Amino acid sequence: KGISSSAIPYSRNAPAWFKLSSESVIEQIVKYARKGLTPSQIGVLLRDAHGVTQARVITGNKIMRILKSNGLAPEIPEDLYYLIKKAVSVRKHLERNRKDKDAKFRLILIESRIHRLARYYRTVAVLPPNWKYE
Amino acid sequence: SSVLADALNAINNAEKTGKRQVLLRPSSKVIIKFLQVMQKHGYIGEFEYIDDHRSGKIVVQLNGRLNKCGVISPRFNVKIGDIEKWTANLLPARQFGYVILTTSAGIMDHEEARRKHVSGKILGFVY
Amino acid sequence: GGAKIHLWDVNRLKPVSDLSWGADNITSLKFNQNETDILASTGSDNSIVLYDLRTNSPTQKIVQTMRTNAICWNPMEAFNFVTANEDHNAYYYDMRNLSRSLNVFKDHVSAVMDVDFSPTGDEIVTGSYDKSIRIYKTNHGHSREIYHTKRMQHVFQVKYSMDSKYIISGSDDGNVRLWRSKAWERSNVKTTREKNKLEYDEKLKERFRHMPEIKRISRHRHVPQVIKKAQEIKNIELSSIKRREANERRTRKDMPYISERKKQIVGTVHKY
Amino acid sequence: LVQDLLHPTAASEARKHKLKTLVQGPRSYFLDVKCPGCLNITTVFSHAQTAVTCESCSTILCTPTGGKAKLSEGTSFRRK
Amino acid sequence: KKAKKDFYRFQVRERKKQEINQ
Amino acid sequence: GFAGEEKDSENYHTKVKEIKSNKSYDAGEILASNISLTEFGTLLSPVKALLMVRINLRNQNKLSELLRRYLLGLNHNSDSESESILKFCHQLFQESEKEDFFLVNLESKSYTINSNSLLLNSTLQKFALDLLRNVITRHRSFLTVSHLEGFIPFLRDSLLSENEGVVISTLRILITLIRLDFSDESSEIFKNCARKVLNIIKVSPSTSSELCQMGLKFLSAFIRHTDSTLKDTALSYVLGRVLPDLNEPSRQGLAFNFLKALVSKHIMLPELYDIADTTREIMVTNHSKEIRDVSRSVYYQFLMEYDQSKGRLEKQFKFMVDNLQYPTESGRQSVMELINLIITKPALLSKLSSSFFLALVNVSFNDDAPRCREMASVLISTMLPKLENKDLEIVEKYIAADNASFLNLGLRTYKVSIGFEHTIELDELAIKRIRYILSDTSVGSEHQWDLVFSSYMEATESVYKHGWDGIITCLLYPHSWVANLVHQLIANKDKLEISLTTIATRILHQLGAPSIPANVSIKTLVNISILWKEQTGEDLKYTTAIDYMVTRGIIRSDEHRMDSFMSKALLVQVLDEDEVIAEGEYLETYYSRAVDEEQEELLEDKLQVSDFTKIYTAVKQTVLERRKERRSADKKLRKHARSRE
Amino acid sequence: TDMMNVIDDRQVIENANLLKGKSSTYEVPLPQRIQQRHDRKAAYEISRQEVSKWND
Amino acid sequence: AKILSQAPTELELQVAQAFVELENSSPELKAELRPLQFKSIREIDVAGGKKALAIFVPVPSLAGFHKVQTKLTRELEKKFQDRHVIFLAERTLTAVHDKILEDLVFPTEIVGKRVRYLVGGNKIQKVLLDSKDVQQIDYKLESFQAVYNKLTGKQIVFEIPSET
RNA sequence: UAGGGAUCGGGUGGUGUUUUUUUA
RNA sequence: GGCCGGUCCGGAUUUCCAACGGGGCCUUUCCUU
Ligand SMILES: [Zn+2]
């Protein structure tokens, strides 16, 4: 296993070429989220197009905070959502052709990786306990 | 592993293989104090604190003074009557090297701890 | 040299002058042997700073790559000094033109801890952090001779006695030792037939120096095998850097040639 | 080889990997592109990861690649 | 393109309206 | 000790009892405790009890200021001002002038050589400091030669062989003692320590040290007050050593006193002519107070009290002209103070008072605000002490000197041959009658457009402040009274004119109409109320009450309260004047509520008219409610509150 | 100046009041460290001057 | 006009007159000096002798001072010349010292903080500027460390990873 | 224990040949 | 503790600058908690 990560800069009064305001950023963010875009995708879209560095350093607060602050928050965290729907897609594929024991092994690993952050999220209680795999 | 312990392993074996400068991250403040007192006693040389936002990188430049640092796991309480027997079964000889304790009023080695007449729990050692 | 360089005389208990550029400590310093008002220092900014005490001011600074351990001026040339820095070579600098370190004495394997000149002004001596001192001619740039012994270790301060005959090497294991400079000569008065013979075949070795077995005999020493391994793997990685540089120089348009003497300089205040 | 483990030469800092330096940083860079339909400015990332479309004259500006996104053949950019 | 028909609490509002109207 | 180490340590978080009050304690303590025989010995003995082991520079320096606190307590109370402390000082001056084969020795540890021999000397140095400030007990008529000749042979040792701690104070003592004529051996000691400070400057490679600065002050006193100063080339060397230090003026001070002393004793030194150049330079460009002032003192004393070449004596004034434009805002003021001293404490004033007048005019026309006041003051002082021909040509160039002519006319009038000034006022009247064209009408039109550069105006307002021709001027003053501060100055001029000599109704209505569509406006409102009380009597009174109701933002509300205070028969004229003052019965709103309480306090007929006016306001509220209910901004009736909060 | 050019226009007496035939003096000055760099550049020049003696 | 409610100084009135002067020369500015406000200014000399003006802005207008800061600071370095000028924020606390440093230097950058711990027990706290604007940046570094010194108590040395 | 030469997968930069050009 | 007159030809008056220490004190003003 190796490293593949972004290295956010030492600057935090970013970025001094930013002509744009700090309210149109929040406007674009709520536009994209009520268009139905996950936090990662709204971040990358306004990173590329309406070029921000990151909204946590242009606005004073991260985008999950401003999504909750504008009443648009998710009901499950993004990672658990993506990993759940990956689990249901691999389950649908194995249900279609049940001989794929490699998909069985991968499904065991995917469900274990579900249970990891599931019990993490129960211990921190972002989504409430009694919760076990929808 | 710990954060003080691997930094001490780094500056131990790096001068065992005989270099002059080492790097150590994540550089907590107990590492700051721990090699603060050893450059006070003249076992390393000057050291820089590169400060990013993540954790910080301490760069120690050192000559061939030192031969062994080391931490003690776990960190348990010792008395004024105990620090002499800990310097006995922890250092090679008596008046040579030091033993570093987290005392209550500061962070010091054994001789300044018994000079200020305080104690605390044992932290690490260097000779 | 401390956290800031102070000038004081022995008649008053206060620093007569501060002298530093800015906030950086001064790792060593040395006065001159002639034009005694001028002096040099080396700070942990990897920097050489010359000071003149007539104007009572620092007067130029260069920054090199790695930290300069110790300066020593020239007794004869009086405006040439030698810096010993932590990349494994000493640098015979000028003073009046500080942009080209006009000689580089190269053959070490670790940090060069100090250096001084012979009092005759043409043969310098470096002692380094590897367990070996060595003596250089001024106008070559490679080792005339290597001294080492098993008991000396991490030799920190080597100086040259005031009659250019002995090399005092103070190590890190405690001991301070004497060496001869010309390691084959002896220190008694000689009858003139011996003086004529030793001087005769000295001149004779000098003129037949480039024959390819006189050269291998007069070049053969016995280094400790730590220094042998480090020198040969330094050679293979330097050949590798030279080869990859040759490939880039074959392709790329303008990778301009920099001299070996100009390589280590990373900067200089007062460009002219 | 043998390097000053403090502040090294900028020629080596721009040479080594963006994680392995003494203080890590980015290497992507923002840049102003002129969409050639109606000439007006928009910023764009370098490793742009998605097809930006300048909503004024909504043609296309850069298609993404594994690294730096290549720009679309009539565009003109200022690095900033 | 990559919009989602899930994942938001206004989307659980619209789908509870769905699951009570149908 | 350990409490001080824990108080100045670092791994020690907080408490309220942190600031060390002990240094203040001892300076408050020895006031009572100055027995100066026994308890003072029990003060100074624990000093030595730590001063026999090891003391760093930190502990040394805090102990040195602790001894300064002791000496400040002695300055407060000096318990006996008759020589029992002086014998004590003299007392402390006298005080501070094969067997190993059997010997087991175990746990060997070496000591260090520092412990005895640093403390052999440092205690002596600190005792000499303490004692010698005790000799700078400054009480007059306690210095006699019979008092001090016991102390001269002790201080003559600790001047020479002291190493820098006390020397600065010993020659401070000699500065205090240079007045009293001592014995011959001691005057030899004075000249010997003059040679000592000469060797100090010869050895020290900087004059900006406290030692050389204090020694320069001593050589200042030795230059000023002795019989025969000598070694003139040696003091020329000293001055040549001084001159390259003046790129950095930093507590030079004492050095400028030295310059004062030898320029007062008037020794011809050719390097002083370069000293004057550099002190002019630092006099302008130096960015501190009082160093520029002492440089003005030395440069001025040189310029007035030394000779000069007959081109250089005007070249320095050309430098004065070239520094009169200086870009900082206080160096120019220092230039102005030196020009003030030039004009004050001569035919040189007449010879230079043309260029100086032109440059002071150009500095009056400068951009610095508070420097313009000094420019006006120096212009007045230059015009008053001027000669006949100089002031005549000055007034001629000021008259002939278009907005340039306006500003020069204003300046010449402000300086203002009173008949010649009236002739200049006649040409200024030719300017002023042409200087009133539709400006106040354009201002009222701009006010109406808002509700929908005045350079010659301010110059003519200044001319009106200076002043049937005056009646025509007062008529034009009403034309510009009827650019906010310009109209305020015009209103002040018209108020002064109407206080000097239908018209009152027009003036009061034009005053009221200006407030609707400042402190000068408050002054004009008080003047207009004076005119209304001096005044179709009942018709104009109803017009004034209607104007007050049309008035009743903070300035207009204060004008309404002022008009109601000027109005308050008690109610037979004030029936039509409480139509808005009772309607008002947010710090401006709190002041308006205080104004409503003032109008209510300052009566049976008035209370009846007030109750009828309250019923009339209820009727007007009913009429507005009927208009609204017949009209029926649904969401706009709450949009104001939803946008406010 | 503008005031001087508007005043001194007619009369022949100019050599008494219009002494300003030369431009201004006395720059800002430069800040402390920059002044240090400049005069120590001058120090390096005079030091090289004083060891070019030793060259011969 | 646009100060906080306490009575200002006369030089505060002079720089406010410079502000209303730039507002008199209006239509080259994009109504940028309409929402201005400052709590207080204060001027203090440096060891170089010349003074520096800390102007405390109540911080929507630190970012409101957006691209106007360079133009108006050369404008008022012409108008109220020769005194180095800076705009600042106001009231853990390492964050507020960090932020007042970050806008204290310029809107240029800082790129890294070092602090070396010498062999005598002392420390030297270096801050590292960007690479740019250096001809006007180098003229005010001692002023910056002086105002950070007397505004924090801390000791800071500024330098650029460049020649000087 | 470290160093070196390759090679596979990705990326960055260089600037010569294979390549091509208004279809992607 | 230093720097400036203005009373008279060195004793009393005064301004500013520094160093200690003294006093009122600037920041939860709007909100359940
Ligand atoms: Zn377009």
The answer to the question of residue A105 being in a domain is yes
CATH number, position D57: 2.20.25.100
Which nucleotide in the DNA or RNA is closest to residue H91, CA to C1'? J27
The four Cα atoms D45, D46, D51, D55 give a dihedral, to 10 degrees, of 40
- The answer to whether F575 and F605 have CB atoms below 8 angstroms apart is no
Cα of F176 from ligand 1 centre, angstroms: 87
Could you give the CA distance from residue H10 to residue A107 in angstroms, rounded to a whole number? 77
Could you give the CA distance from residue F420 to residue F401 in angstroms, rounded to a whole number? 16
Q: How many residues does chain E have?
A: 22
A contact chains, 3+ CB pairs < 8 A = B, D, E, H
> Contacts for F265-268 with beta carbons within 8 Å, 24 or more apart?
F265/F223, F265/F224, F265/F229, F266/F305, F266/F306, F267/F229, F267/F232, F267/F235
Determine if residue G41 is labeled as part of a ligand binding site: no
CA of F289 to C1' of J17 (A): 8
- Side by side, which strands form the sheet with B57-61? B21-24, B57-61, B47-51, H112-117, H123-128, H157-159
Determine if residue G17 is labeled as part of a ligand binding site: yes
DSSP state of D42: E
DSSP A95-109: HHSTT-HHHHHHHHH
- Do residue A41 and residue A78 come from a single domain? no
- Do residue A103 and residue A129 come from a single domain? yes
Instruction: Work out how many CB contacts closer than 8 A connect B with F.
Output: 14
Distances (CA, A) of H118 to A66, B36, B37: 45, 10, 12
Could you give the CA distance from residue H100 to residue H93 in angstroms, rounded to a whole number? 10
**What pairs with residue C47 in β-bridges?**
C43, C63
Could you give the CA distance from residue F194 to residue F226 in angstroms, rounded to a whole number? 12
Could you give the CA distance from residue F412 to residue F27 in angstroms, rounded to a whole number? 62
The answer to the question of residue A61 being in a domain is yes
Q: By three-state DSSP, how is residue F253 classified?
A: coil
**What pairs with residue B111 in β-bridges?**
none
In B, minimum Cα distance to H95 occurs at B53
Residues of chain A in Cβ contact (below 8 Å) with chain E: 33-38, 41, 72-76, 78, 81, 85
The four Cα atoms F327, H137, H34, H100 give a dihedral, to 10 degrees, of -120
DSSP F330-384: THHHHHHHHHHHHH---HHHHHHTTHHHHHHHHHHTSS-HHHHHHHHHHHHHHHT
Could you give the CA distance from residue F361 to residue F321 in angstroms, rounded to a whole number? 12
Q: Domain count of chain D? A: 1
**What single-letter amino acid sits at F310?**
K
For the record, the structure tokens of F410 come out as 């204003």
Determine if residue G42 is labeled as part of a ligand binding site: no
- The answer to whether D52 and A48 have CB atoms below 8 angstroms apart is yes
CA of H7 to C1' of J18 (A): 28
Q: Which DSSP helix (H) or strand (E) runs through F521?
A: helix F519-534
Q: By three-state DSSP, how is residue C267 classified?
A: strand
**What single-letter amino acid sits at C134?**
R
Q: Determine the residue among A37, A42, A46, A48 to mutate to test chain D binding: the one whose Cβ has the most chain D Cβ atoms within 10 Å.
A: A48
β-pairing, C68-73 vs B98-103, is unpaired
- The answer to whether F158 and F166 have CB atoms below 8 angstroms apart is yes
**What single-letter amino acid sits at A83?**
L
Could you give the CA distance from residue C38 to residue C48 in angstroms, rounded to a whole number? 13
Burial class (CB in 10 A: 0-12, 13-18, 19+), C127: buried
The answer to the question of residue A30 being in a domain is yes
Ranges of H-type helices in chain H:
10-24, 61-64, 69-79, 94-105, 134-137, 141-152
The answer to the question of residue A6 being in a domain is no
Q: Determine the residue among F328, F332, F454, F587 to mutate to test chain H binding: the one whose Cβ has the most chain H Cβ atoms within 10 Å.
A: F328
Residue B54 to chain A, least CA–CA distance (Å): 9
The four Cα atoms F622, F625, F630, F634 give a dihedral, to 10 degrees, of -170
Which nucleotide in the DNA or RNA is closest to residue C240, CA to C1'? I4
Residue C162 to chain B, least CA–CA distance (Å): 29
Which letter, b or e, does each residue of F292-322 get, where b requires 16 or more Cβ atoms within 10 Å of its Cβ? bebbbbbbbbbbeeeeeeeeeebeebbbbbb
- Do residue A63 and residue A86 come from a single domain? no
CA of H99 to C1' of J24 (A): 32
- The answer to whether F368 and F332 have CB atoms below 8 angstroms apart is yes
- The answer to whether F70 and F85 have CB atoms below 8 angstroms apart is no
Residue C9 to chain F, least CA–CA distance (Å): 9
Cβ contact, residue pair B18, C86, below 8 Å: no
Footprint of strand J on the protein (CB under 7 A): F 21, 23-24, 27, 65, 69, 75, 138, 140-141, 253, 257, 289-290, 293-294, 297; H 91
Residues in Cβ contact with B98 at an 8 Å cutoff, skipping those fewer than 6 apart: B37, B38, B41, B91, B109, B110, B111, B125, B126, B127
Q: By three-state DSSP, how is residue C252 classified?
A: coil
β-pairing, C103-105 vs C90-94, is antiparallel
Q: Taking CB atoms and an 8 Å cutoff, what residues of chain H touch F287?
A: 45, 48-51
**What single-letter amino acid sits at G55?**
N
For the record, the structure tokens of H59 come out as 């911080």
β-pairing, C47-52 vs C57-64, is antiparallel
Nucleotides of J under 7 A from a protein CB: 1-4, 10-11, 16-17, 20-22, 27
For the record, the structure tokens of F237 come out as 């060397």
Footprint of strand I on the protein (CB under 7 A): C 233, 236-237, 240, 243-244, 251-253; D 65-68
Distances (CA, A) of A10 to B72, D44, F234, F319: 35, 21, 61, 52
Residues in Cβ contact with F221 at an 8 Å cutoff, skipping those fewer than 6 apart: F174, F175, F178, F261
Range of the domain at A51: 19-73
3-state secondary structure A18-86: CCCCCCHHHHHHHHHHHCCCCHHHHHHHHHHCCCCCCHHHHCCCCHHHHHHHCCCCCCCCHHHHHHHHH
- Do residue A87 and residue A63 come from a single domain? no
- The answer to whether B32 and B56 have CB atoms below 8 angstroms apart is no
Could you give the CA distance from residue C92 to residue C111 in angstroms, rounded to a whole number? 16
Cβ neighbours of B85 (radius 10 Å) = 11
Which nucleotide in the DNA or RNA is closest to residue F19, CA to C1'? J21
CA of F140 to C1' of J7 (A): 20
Q: Which DSSP helix (H) or strand (E) runs through C192?
A: helix C192-207
Q: Which of C118, C165, C127 is nearest to C148 (CA)?
A: C127
Residue A115 to chain D, least CA–CA distance (Å): 31
Cα of F132 from ligand 1 centre, angstroms: 87
Could you give the CA distance from residue F371 to residue A39 in angstroms, rounded to a whole number? 61
Q: Would the CA dihedral through A97, A100, A105, A110 be positive or negative?
A: negative
The answer, for A12 touching chain B at a CB cutoff of 8 Å, is: yes
- The answer to whether B100 and B109 have CB atoms below 8 angstroms apart is yes
Could you give the CA distance from residue C117 to residue C162 in angstroms, rounded to a whole number? 10
Q: Which of D70, D79, D69 is nearest to D29 (CA)?
A: D79
For the record, the structure tokens of B40 come out as 């006070």
User: Which residue among C7, C11, C54 places its CB closest to the CB of F163?
Assistant: C11
Cβ neighbours of F246 (radius 10 Å) = 20
Distances (CA, A) of F492 to A93, D61, F435, F486, F501: 95, 69, 18, 10, 14
**What single-letter amino acid sits at B103?**
T
- The answer to whether F584 and F564 have CB atoms below 8 angstroms apart is no
Distances (CA, A) of C70 to C28, C114, C125, C168: 6, 5, 12, 16
- Do residue A63 and residue A25 come from a single domain? yes
CA C174 to chain centre: 23
Cα of D37 from ligand 1 centre, angstroms: 4
Burial class (CB in 10 A: 0-12, 13-18, 19+), F107: exposed
E contact chains, 3+ CB pairs < 8 A = A
Which nucleotide in the DNA or RNA is closest to residue F294, CA to C1'? J3
- The answer to whether F182 and F148 have CB atoms below 8 angstroms apart is yes
- The answer to whether C148 and C223 have CB atoms below 8 angstroms apart is yes
Q: Determine the residue among B21, B23, B31, B46 to mutate to test chain H binding: the one whose Cβ has the most chain H Cβ atoms within 10 Å.
A: B46
Cα of F228 from ligand 1 centre, angstroms: 93
Which nucleotide in the DNA or RNA is closest to residue D65, CA to C1'? I11
Could you give the CA distance from residue F355 to residue F373 in angstroms, rounded to a whole number? 20
What ranges do the domains of chain H cover? 1-162
Cβ contact, residue pair F11, B106, below 8 Å: yes
CA of C259 to C1' of I1 (A): 35
- The answer to whether B56 and B86 have CB atoms below 8 angstroms apart is no
Residues in Cβ contact with C53 at an 8 Å cutoff, skipping those fewer than 6 apart: C7, C37, C38, C39, F205
- Side by side, which strands form the sheet with D76-79? D41-44, D31-34, D76-79
Q: Determine the residue among D2, D19, D22, D24 to mutate to test chain B binding: the one whose Cβ has the most chain B Cβ atoms within 10 Å.
A: D22
- Do residue A79 and residue A124 come from a single domain? yes
- The crossing angle, in degrees rounded to 10, of helices F167-177 and F210-224 is 20
- The answer to whether C169 and C154 have CB atoms below 8 angstroms apart is no
For the record, the structure tokens of F118 come out as 């640093």
D contact chains, 3+ CB pairs < 8 A = A, B, C, H
Distances (CA, A) of D53 to A19, A31, D48, D72, G25: 19, 17, 12, 11, 59
Residues in Cβ contact with F219 at an 8 Å cutoff, skipping those fewer than 6 apart: F194, F197, F198, F235, F238, F258
Residues in Cβ contact with F498 at an 8 Å cutoff, skipping those fewer than 6 apart: F474, F504, F507, F527, F531
- The answer to whether F295 and F304 have CB atoms below 8 angstroms apart is no
Say which residue the tokens 């630092």 belong to: F282
Cβ contact, residue pair E11, A36, below 8 Å: yes
- Do residue A133 and residue A79 come from a single domain? yes
Cβ neighbours of D63 (radius 10 Å) = 13
- Do residue A93 and residue A113 come from a single domain? yes
Distances (CA, A) of C75 to C26, C36, C103: 23, 11, 17
Could you give the CA distance from residue B22 to residue B13 in angstroms, rounded to a whole number? 10
CA of F645 to C1' of J31 (A): 14
The answer, for G1 touching chain F at a CB cutoff of 8 Å, is: yes
- The crossing angle, in degrees rounded to 10, of helices F403-415 and F369-383 is 60
Could you give the CA distance from residue C201 to residue C215 in angstroms, rounded to a whole number? 15
Cβ contact, residue pair B116, F107, below 8 Å: no
- The crossing angle, in degrees rounded to 10, of helices F272-285 and F331-343 is 120
Could you give the CA distance from residue F104 to residue F106 in angstroms, rounded to a whole number? 6
For the record, the structure tokens of H9 come out as 């100084």
- The answer to whether F190 and F178 have CB atoms below 8 angstroms apart is yes
The four Cα atoms H18, H19, H25, H31 give a dihedral, to 10 degrees, of 170
The answer, for D5 touching chain H at a CB cutoff of 8 Å, is: no
DSSP C91-148: EEEESS-TTS-SEEE---SS-EEEEEE-TTSSEEEEEESSS-EEEEETTT-SEEEEE-
Determine if residue G15 is labeled as part of a ligand binding site: no
Cα-flanking dihedrals φ and ψ of residue E5, to 5°? -100, 35
Q: How many residues does chain H have?
A: 164
What is the stated resolution of the deposited model, in angstroms? 3.8
The answer to the question of residue A5 being in a domain is no
Q: By three-state DSSP, how is residue F524 classified?
A: helix
Could you give the CA distance from residue F597 to residue F564 in angstroms, rounded to a whole number? 12
Cα-flanking dihedrals φ and ψ of residue D38, to 5°? -115, 125
Q: By three-state DSSP, how is residue B79 classified?
A: coil
Q: Domain count of chain A? A: 2
Cα of A66 from ligand 1 centre, angstroms: 32
Cα of D42 from ligand 1 centre, angstroms: 10
Say which residue the tokens 């791994």 belong to: F11
In H, minimum Cα distance to A18 occurs at H66
Say which residue the tokens 């009135």 belong to: H13
CA of F205 to C1' of J2 (A): 26
- Do residue A67 and residue A38 come from a single domain? yes
CA C54 to chain centre: 27
DSSP C54-85: TTTEEEEEEEESS-EEEEEE-SSSSSEEEEEE
In F, minimum Cα distance to C11 occurs at F163
